[PDB]
Amino acid sequence: CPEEIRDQLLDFHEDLMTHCGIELDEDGSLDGSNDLTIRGRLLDLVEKVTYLKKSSLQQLISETMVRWAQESVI
Amino acid sequence: PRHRAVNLFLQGYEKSWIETEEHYFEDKLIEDLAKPGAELPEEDEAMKRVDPLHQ
Question: By the 8 A CB rule, do A27 and A35 touch?
Fold first, then answer.
């Protein structure tokens, strides 16, 4: 007897899309959140990267670059 | 901890989800600041500068 006798082997034939791809298909199967207890942490870190951090350096660089390009033709 | 496909997954997520918002946001502000108008030429010349975008 197998692990599960639901239909053939497992729930919704986990072997079919588990053995077909592990390095790529398994990682691509995580289409979004509401899958495990780490999706919230992953979303939090993704939002944590995108604060446009530098932000003072980036805004000062943009300001001084506009000032350089605006005073006269170069 | 010996496979790097998680980095590729994060790269795909970055180019998929946040890239659209970044493209929708970054294109406007640069064009708004193309002509701030804060620095007057203060010169007695008729050269009549318009924008650095002309340059």
Answer: no
Name which of A27, A69, A74 is nearest B9 (Cβ-Cβ). Answer: A27
Q: Which technique was the structure solved with, according to the deposited record? A: cryo-EM
8 A C-beta contact, residue A70 and residue B52: yes
Nearest to A46 by CA among B13, B4, B26, B22: B13
Tokens of A68: 């350089």
Distance CA B14, CA A46 (A): 8
A62 interaction partners in chain B (CB closer than 8 Å): 33
CB contact under 8 A, B39 and A67: yes
**CA–CA distance, A57 with A63 (Å, rounded to integer):** 10
